[PDB]
Amino acid sequence: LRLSYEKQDTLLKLLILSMAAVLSFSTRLFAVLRFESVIHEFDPYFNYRTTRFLAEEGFYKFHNWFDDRAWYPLGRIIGGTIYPGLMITSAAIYHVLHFFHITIDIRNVCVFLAPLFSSFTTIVTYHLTKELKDAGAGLLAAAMIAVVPGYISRSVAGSYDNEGIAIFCMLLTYYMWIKAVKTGSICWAAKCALAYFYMVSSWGGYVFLINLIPLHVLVLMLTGRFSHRIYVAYCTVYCLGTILSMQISFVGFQPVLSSEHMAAFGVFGLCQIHAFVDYLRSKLNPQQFEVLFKISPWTGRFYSLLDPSYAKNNIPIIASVSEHQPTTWSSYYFDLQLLVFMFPVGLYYCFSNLSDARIFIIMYGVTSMYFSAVMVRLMLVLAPVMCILSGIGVSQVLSTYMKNLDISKNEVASGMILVMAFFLITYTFHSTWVTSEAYSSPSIVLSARIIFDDFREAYYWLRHNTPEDAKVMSWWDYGYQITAMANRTILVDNNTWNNTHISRVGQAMASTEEKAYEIMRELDVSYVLVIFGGLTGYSSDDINKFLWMVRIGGSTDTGKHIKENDYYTPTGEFRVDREGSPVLLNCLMYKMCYYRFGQVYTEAKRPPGFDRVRNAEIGNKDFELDVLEEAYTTEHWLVRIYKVKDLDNRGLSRT
Amino acid sequence: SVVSVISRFLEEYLSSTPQRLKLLDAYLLYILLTGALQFGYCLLVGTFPFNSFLSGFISCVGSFILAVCLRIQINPQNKADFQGISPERAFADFLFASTILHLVVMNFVG
Amino acid sequence: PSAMTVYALVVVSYFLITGGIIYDVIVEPPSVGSRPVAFLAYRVNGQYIMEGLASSFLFTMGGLGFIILDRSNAPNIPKLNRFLLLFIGFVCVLLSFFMARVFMRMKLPGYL
Amino acid sequence: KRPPTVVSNTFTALILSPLLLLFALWIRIGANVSNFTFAPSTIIFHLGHAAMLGLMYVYWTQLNMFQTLKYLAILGSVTFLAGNRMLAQQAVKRT
Amino acid sequence: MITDVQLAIFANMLGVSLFLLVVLYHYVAVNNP
Amino acid sequence: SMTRVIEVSHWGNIAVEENVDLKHTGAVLKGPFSRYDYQRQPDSGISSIRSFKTILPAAAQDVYYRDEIGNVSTSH
Amino acid sequence: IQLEFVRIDPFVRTFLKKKGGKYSVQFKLPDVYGVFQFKVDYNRLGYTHLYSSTQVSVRPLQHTQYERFIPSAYPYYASAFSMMLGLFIFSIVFLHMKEK
Numbered sequence A: 001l002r003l004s005y006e007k008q009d010t011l012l013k014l015l016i017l018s019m020a021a022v023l024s025f026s027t028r029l030f031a032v033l034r035f036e037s038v039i040h041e042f043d044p045y046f047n048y049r050t051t052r053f054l055a056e057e058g059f060y061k062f063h064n065w066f067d068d069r070a071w072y073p074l075g076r077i078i079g080g081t082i083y084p085g086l087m088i089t090s091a092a093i094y095h096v097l098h099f100f101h102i103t104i105d106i107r108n109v110c111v112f113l114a115p116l117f118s119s120f121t122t123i124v125t126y127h128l129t130k131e132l133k134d135a136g137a138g139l140l141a142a143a144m145i146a147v148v149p150g151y152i153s154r155s156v157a158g159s160y161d162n163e164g165i166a167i168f169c170m171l172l173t174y175y176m177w178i179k180a181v182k183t184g185s186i187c188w189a190a191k192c193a194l195a196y197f198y199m200v201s202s203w204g205g206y207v208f209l210i211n212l213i214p215l216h217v218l219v220l221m222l223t224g225r226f227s228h229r230i231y232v233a234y235c236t237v238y239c240l241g242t243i244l245s246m247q248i249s250f251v252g253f254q255p256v257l258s259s260e261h262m263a264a265f266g267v268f269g270l271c272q273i274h275a276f277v278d279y280l281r282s283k284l285n286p287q288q289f290e291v292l293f294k295i296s297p298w299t300g301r302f303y304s305l306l307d308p309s310y311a312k313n314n315i316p317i318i319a320s321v322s323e324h325q326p327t328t329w330s331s332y333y334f335d336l337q338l339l340v341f342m343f344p345v346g347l348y349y350c351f352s353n354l355s356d357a358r359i360f361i362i363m364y365g366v367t368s369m370y371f372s373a374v375m376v377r378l379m380l381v382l383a384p385v386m387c388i389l390s391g392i393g394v395s396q397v398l399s400t401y402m403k404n405l406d407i408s409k410n411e412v413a414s415g416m417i418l419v420m421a422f423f424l425i426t427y428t429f430h431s432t433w434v435t436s437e438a439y440s441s442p443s444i445v446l447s448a449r450i451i452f453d454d455f456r457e458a459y460y461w462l463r464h465n466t467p468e469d470a471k472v473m474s475w476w477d478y479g480y481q482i483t484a485m486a487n488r489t490i491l492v493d494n495n496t497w498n499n500t501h502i503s504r505v506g507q508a509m510a511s512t513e514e515k516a517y518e519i520m521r522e523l524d525v526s527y528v529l530v531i532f533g534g535l536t537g538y539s540s541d542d543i544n545k546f547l548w549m550v551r552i553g554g555s556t557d558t559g560k561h562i563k564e565n566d567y568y569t570p571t572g573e574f575r576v577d578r579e580g581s582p583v584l585l586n587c588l589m590y591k592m593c594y595y596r597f598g599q600v601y602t603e604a605k606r607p608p609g610f611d612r613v614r615n616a617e618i619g620n621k622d623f624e625l626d627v628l629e630e631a632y633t634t635e636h637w638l639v640r641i642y643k644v645k646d647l648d649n650r651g652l653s654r655t
Numbered sequence B: 001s002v003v004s005v006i007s008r009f010l011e012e013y014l015s016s017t018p019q020r021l022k023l024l025d026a027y028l029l030y031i032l033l034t035g036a037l038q039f040g041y042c043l044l045v046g047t048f049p050f051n052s053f054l055s056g057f058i059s060c061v062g063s064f065i066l067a068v069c070l071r072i073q074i075n076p077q078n079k080a081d082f083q084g085i086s087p088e089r090a091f092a093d094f095l096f097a098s099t100i101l102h103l104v105v106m107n108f109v110g
Numbered sequence C: 001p002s003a004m005t006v007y008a009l010v011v012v013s014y015f016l017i018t019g020g021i022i023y024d025v026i027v028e029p030p031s032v033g034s035r036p037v038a039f040l041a042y043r044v045n046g047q048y049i050m051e052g053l054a055s056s057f058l059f060t061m062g063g064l065g066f067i068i069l070d071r072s073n074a075p076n077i078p079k080l081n082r083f084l085l086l087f088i089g090f091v092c093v094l095l096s097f098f099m100a101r102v103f104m105r106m107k108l109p110g111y112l
Numbered sequence D: 001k002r003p004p005t006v007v008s009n010t011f012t013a014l015i016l017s018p019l020l021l022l023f024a025l026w027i028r029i030g031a032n033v034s035n036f037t038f039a040p041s042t043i044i045f046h047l048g049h050a051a052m053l054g055l056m057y058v059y060w061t062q063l064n065m066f067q068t069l070k071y072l073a074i075l076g077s078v079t080f081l082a083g084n085r086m087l088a089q090q091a092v093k094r095t
Numbered sequence E: 001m002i003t004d005v006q007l008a009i010f011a012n013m014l015g016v017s018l019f020l021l022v023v024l025y026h027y028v029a030v031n032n033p
Numbered sequence F: 001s002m003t004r005v006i007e008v009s010h011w012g013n014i015a016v017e018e019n020v021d022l023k024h025t026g027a028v029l030k031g032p033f034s035r036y037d038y039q040r041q042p043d044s045g046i047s048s049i050r051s052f053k054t055i056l057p058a059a060a061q062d063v064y065y066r067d068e069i070g071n072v073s074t075s076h
Numbered sequence G: 001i002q003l004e005f006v007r008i009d010p011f012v013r014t015f016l017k018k019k020g021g022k023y024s025v026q027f028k029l030p031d032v033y034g035v036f037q038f039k040v041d042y043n044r045l046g047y048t049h050l051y052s053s054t055q056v057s058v059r060p061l062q063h064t065q066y067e068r069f070i071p072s073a074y075p076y077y078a079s080a081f082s083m084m085l086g087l088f089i090f091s092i093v094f095l096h097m098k099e100k
């Protein structure tokens, strides 16, 4: 009342912003209230085990670092193969607290760093949208960003992966570029180069930034809107950004001799070839001017995003992961509700008033949408831009219907604000439900309250009851955990940087017992860890993914007898019952995944030796492993650890 | 046959251009020449140390581009696209960008 | 040129993409129910062609409705035409936002 | 394989020719430093900038990226404050 | 600690209040003098 | 080994936490271990220790049993 | 007695030289990095078997051990420094010049 318009306005903007921030930080906090604060899934177990070694030992003792506890015979270098972004933002955030005598743990400032960086995303989004248009349509973006279900899936409290901290860097870089294009100041461009540098060091998806920018300038150059502002900004950002990007040891000399970063360069030369021509035309006349008138190819990984079928045909490892398939009508709406509708309206409102800044948002939305269409995992990029577009659209509708009200036809004018409020509420509800029920489930804690924590008990056993120089060999999926929890030297890791060693391990499985033993001697493997999952109903059994093992071991020069369409039955169906193919019933994988199993009564009224996951009886009821004596089998038979026997003493053929 | 126009253009650019702006062009030519020499020596011998030549060449392309940016902003004629960017706030910005560029060049070179 | 003639193309591509055309082409799913049931039982991302194109069309309507609404507000429009235009926009908005929700519930029983 | 030392020394001798050419061209244009007035702020700014460049060379031979940055964080701040003062004065004089 | 249900209810209430407040802000914005 | 840490605080309470390394001494196991025999046979694993009971001081408020790797579900 | 420096297959295989009761040999480590194994194996007819194997790890290098100030790259370093000096000179002239 008595408060002036200024004070009221700013106190409302501040209130709403603070509330949005708290909302975002307190909605990705479900996996912690239910189960204790522990990092989850296959990747966050490596980033953690690296940030920890970078905390105690100074940065200079981590830039170069040879980890001889992964790919045992080979050994992988962690110093120059990983983007050191997350580890230096977490080490710094931990060191500052220690300097302030907070003395927090390194496993507690490393779990709550995704939600914290999803509380700074809100502010950056609010500004990135307070630039394209009025503050009025900026807040409406922040709150929607706070509770966007697709983004929340990759940034819950416990997912220490460079994917909930990458979006923040992308937004900051875009805000810097938008400011540079809007104003043209050298300083702003610089402050963008720096953001790109802090983004090329944390997220492997920085090719987007050196491919949307050239696209943006090309469009701002084909329609005839290329002024000196864009020229100055682009050139400065290019130079500084590329030189900064080359610093990182992992990137090396990629920006200058690769076909992924050839866009920026081409647009640079076509920028000059344009500015100079304009200058010449200004100082000349039509008549005289008329008179005068090694590089590597597209790497398969990034090429798979263009051709959506290249993966299936050629790369037999990128198609394995579930989250590598095209998105359906049931993923877009499930993760983004009411945003999908808002996207066309936001586009239309942009296309209505083209400007230097907007022609960038439209390009980003058009590209990101297609990239999300090809692969479900890319939904990271899509949700923020869609949210920004949604913010620019609902607000416009509200603004259009906010002036018609007599206080500021009346019934029709209200009908819109009321419908919009109802849609916003429905969106908040659906977002909370999606975060709660589904996108929040601990990976290593199979639960139905009954808790199955075998994935931890077996690793702890390994870590405590094996010689300090074991060689636990398991599928590349579990490499990150075994080295962070079991603390052994797993033969294959999750980076899959050698497609012959992994093929080797594949061959060692789904083969005759002899061949397997022979392959399990060159690498000096001792223990063997297979995730049975049959007795508990686990969906992702080792047998379930055993097709990938047979299809990635028989695709190299070393082994070809393992050809597919041989483990199948005459009718080509993968049945693991008594009528299955004889070779299948004899491979090392199955032989070590159903050993002394055709006796347990898994179900009330079923044949003794039943399998819950495949709903079929076992074929090889009783057999004795020749080389693999048993060593441990967890209470629920969820993870079985065997141990390769040594060469026979008397030199007999067996064992 | 096409030299008359070139000479006329140069003459024009030697009367219609204010001082304290030609000097910028001279320094720009200097950078363009040091870059040309660098590239020529690279072609003549090839590159054993790649990061050495690459960062002893960017350290010139970046400077050249910063100089051109300063000439653009300083130019009074081009004071419609840039609003509120006084010449002093352009020179200081150029100095800051140059400092970053040189620091990174020093870090990258051997 | 013709800046709008581009927004039309973009909207058409958006309709084709949000109907999972990439999924259809990549992994051909039979557009049939095994009495035919259109929607898949429980898979979070399992698309039959009928579930896809039909769901997408709804989103496109859920966008054109708003565009029609905002366009109607323009002044100097006869009341007879304005009333019809606003009616069409409201019907498209409400109908799309309810049909999509019902479709989602049907595809995934236990929703909300 | 590395090229002969003569082919390297000749070129390093030549790389020094452009800088001399620049001076030979400037002294031709007619640039002078008459506007210099021995003001405190201006001399402090120029000295700071010179020290900053010198540091850019002392971080090559000896220093590591963790001591050079702190020194820059100090010399740059001194250079910035003096520069800003001198730039403000210059701006006022220009008007 | 805090029951999951409690947190969900708090999230719902906060989101609804934040959206109503955003609408109110739009009304105040348009009403500028 | 056992490390007993007793932190005193004049504001509220006193919190004691103890790390316990414990090892089974006699009759080191040899040969394969089989969960099937352990479950379906009472005679199997006589020397094994499934659980032990720790008497607390009758005033403990929130007792957290946690291993190095994470919170352990099983304790009564 | 034959010493073998092996990763999966012997990279190096030399003869230990007797010297004061010890079998000692000195050899440059192979360029390939990774984990390696000293593996002295002495299996002969009518004798005892000898399989001594000590695991060793060969890290690739350190960013502080590459060669610097290479003579071949003298033109690059000088040019970078020339740019740094040029800017300084330019700055002074830019700040203090009287028009004609």
Ligand SMILES: CC(=O)N[C@H]1[C@H](O[C@H]2[C@H](O)[C@@H](NC(C)=O)[C@@H](OP(=O)(O)OP(=O)(O)OC/C=C(\C)CC/C=C(/C)CC/C=C(/C)CC/C=C(/C)CC/C=C(/C)CC/C=C(/C)CC/C=C(/C)CCC=C(C)C)O[C@@H]2CO)O[C@H](CO)[C@@H](O[C@@H]2O[C@H](CO[C@H]3O[C@H](CO[C@H]4O[C@H](CO)[C@@H](O)[C@H](O)[C@@H]4O)[C@@H](O)[C@H](O)[C@@H]3O)[C@@H](O)[C@H](O[C@H]3O[C@H](CO)[C@@H](O)[C@H](O)[C@@H]3O[C@H]3O[C@H](CO)[C@@H](O)[C@H](O)[C@@H]3O[C@H]3O[C@H](CO)[C@@H](O)[C@H](O[C@H]4O[C@H](CO)[C@@H](O)[C@H](O[C@H]5O[C@H](CO)[C@@H](O)[C@H](O)[C@H]5O[C@H]5O[C@H](CO)[C@@H](O)[C@H](O)[C@H]5O)[C@H]4O)[C@@H]3O)[C@@H]2O)[C@@H]1O
Binding pocket: A075, A076, A077, A080, A081, A082, A083, A162, A202, A203, A204, A205, A207, A208, A211, A212, A214, A215, A218, A249, A250, A252, A262, A263, A265, A266, A267, A270, A301, A302, A303, A305, A306, A317, A318, A367, A371, A378, A381, A494, A495, A496, A497, A498, A499, A500, B047, B048, B049, B050, B051, B052, B109, B110, G060, G066, G067, G068
């Ligand atoms: C499956 C697969 O693939 N996988 C993969 C993996 O993956 C993984 C990853 O990684 C991970 N990650 C992490 C981080 O970890 C994960 O990931 P994730 O999950 O995913 O996560 P993230 O990432 O984060 O996230 C993600 C997300 C996503 C991404 C998202 C996305 C989104 C988006 C959006 C995207 C986008 C897309 C796109 C497409 C874009 C687009 C856009 C748009 C818009 C559209 C549009 C379009 C367009 C085009 C546009 C257009 C526009 C326009 C405008 C138009 C245009 C216009 C125009 C005009 C144009 C123009 C034109 C023109 C210009 C033309 O996970 C995953 C999984 O798990 O990874 C891995 C890695 O690790 C990988 O692997 C890798 O690989 C590689 C390659 O490969 C190779 O191989 C192959 C095969 O074969 C082979 O191999 C095999 C096996 O191995 C065998 O067996 C066989 O036999 C054979 O042999 C081949 O083929 C190929 O070729 C290749 O070769 C490799 O390499 C690697 O390896 C490596 O590594 C490993 C481990 O690490 C190791 O072990 C090994 O050994 C190796 O190592 C190496 O390397 C490293 C690094 O790399 C290092 O460190 C080491 O040491 C080594 O190195 C060495 O070697 C090398 C060889 O290469 C060399 O090179 C080097 O050297 C270098 O470096 C160094 C350092 O480093 C240096 O030193 C040097 O330098 C030096 O020397 C030189 C000589 O010359 C000189 O020069 C210089 O100077 C020096 O320097 C020095 O020195 C001086 C004195 O002297 C001083 O001064 C200084 O200082 C110093 O420095 C250099 O050179 C050495 O030697 C592996 O393996 C896998 O694959």
Ligand SMILES: *[C@@H]1O[C@H](CO)[C@@H](O[C@@H]2O[C@H](CO)[C@@H](O[C@@H]3O[C@H](CO[C@H]4O[C@H](CO[C@H]5O[C@H](CO)[C@@H](O)[C@H](O)[C@@H]5O)[C@@H](O)[C@H](O[C@H]5O[C@H](CO)[C@@H](O)[C@H](O)[C@@H]5O)[C@@H]4O)[C@@H](O)[C@H](O[C@H]4O[C@H](CO)[C@@H](O)[C@H](O)[C@@H]4O)[C@@H]3O)[C@H](O)[C@H]2NC(C)=O)[C@H](O)[C@H]1NC(C)=O
Binding pocket: A034, A035, A036, A449, A451, F063, F064, F065, F071, F072, F073, F074, F075, F076
């Ligand atoms: C992080 O880690 C912590 C620590 O591990 C963890 O917290 C634990 O969570 C579990 C939940 O699974 C809690 O378990 C509870 O334990 C209660 C205590 O049970 C004891 O007392 C029972 C009562 O017995 C009395 O009465 C009988 C006659 O009825 C009499 O004979 C007795 O002498 C006594 O007077 C007793 O029955 C029970 O016995 C168990 O064990 C024996 C083996 O010795 C077994 O044969 C029995 O069948 C029985 O299982 C035990 O001695 C218990 O009361 C409580 O029960 C509630 O829940 C169950 C379902 O689980 C219901 O069926 C029941 O009706 C009750 O509602 C529950 O079992 C445990 O106390 C926690 N510990 C701590 C320190 O916090 C966290 O969960 C972990 N975090 C996460 C996220 O998981």
Ligand SMILES: CCCCCCCCCCCCCC(=O)O[C@H](COC(=O)CCCCCCCCCC)COP(=O)(O)OCC[N+](C)(C)C
Binding pocket: A218, A219, A222, A223, A354, A359, A362, A363, A366, A370, C001, C002, C003, C004, C006, C009, C010, C013, C014
């Ligand atoms: C999912 C994939 C679907 C593919 C769809 C491709 C569309 C994505 C490109 C988005 C670019 C939007 C920018 C844009 O459309 O600019 C508009 C309209 O003017 C033009 O832009 C004309 C050129 C349009 C294409 C320019 C880029 C082409 C592809 C980029 C490499 C500006 O037009 P104006 O110039 O403002 O209008 C003038 C028209 N007169 C009649 C007056 C002459």
Ligand SMILES: CCCCCCCCCCCCCC(=O)O[C@H](COC(=O)CCCCCCCCCC)COP(=O)(O)OCC[N+](C)(C)C
Binding pocket: A063, A084, A085, A088, A194, A195, A197, A198, A201, A247, A248, A249, B100, B103, B106, B107, B109, B110, D059, D060, D061, D063, D064, D065, D066, G063
């Ligand atoms: C927001 C922007 C900042 C984001 C920070 C993200 C962290 C990314 C750092 C990744 C490290 C890349 C590799 C690298 O930094 O190189 C390290 C030197 O190591 C370092 O110095 C790391 C310093 C990290 C902070 C740098 C601030 C960047 C400001 C640019 C002016 C090696 O340098 P040195 O080992 O010091 O060189 C020794 C020998 N010389 C003669 C060459 C000096």
Ligand SMILES: *[C@@H]1O[C@H](CO)[C@@H](O[C@@H]2O[C@H](CO)[C@@H](O)[C@H](O)[C@H]2NC(C)=O)[C@H](O)[C@H]1NC(C)=O
Binding pocket: A468, A487
């Ligand atoms: C994982 O296992 C390794 C292998 O033993 C442990 O590394 C040892 O750590 C101790 C620290 O108390 C050092 O004294 C030893 O020298 C290390 N071993 C070797 C071979 O160098 C490591 O500590 C274990 N990780 C844990 C316990 O968290």
Ligand SMILES: Cc1cnc(NC(=O)c2cc(S(=O)(=O)N(C)C)ccc2N2CCCC2)s1
Binding pocket: A204, A205, A301, A302, A304, A305, A317, A318, A319, A320, A321, A375
């Ligand atoms: C089985 C796997 C699971 N996850 C994996 N990692 C990638 O697939 C991946 C990695 C990079 S990268 O930047 O790390 N590159 C190594 C420099 C880029 C793109 C990538 N995919 C995005 C779409 C197709 C290729 S492999």
Ligand SMILES: [Mn+2]
Binding pocket: A043, A161, A162, A163
């Ligand atoms: Mn990751």
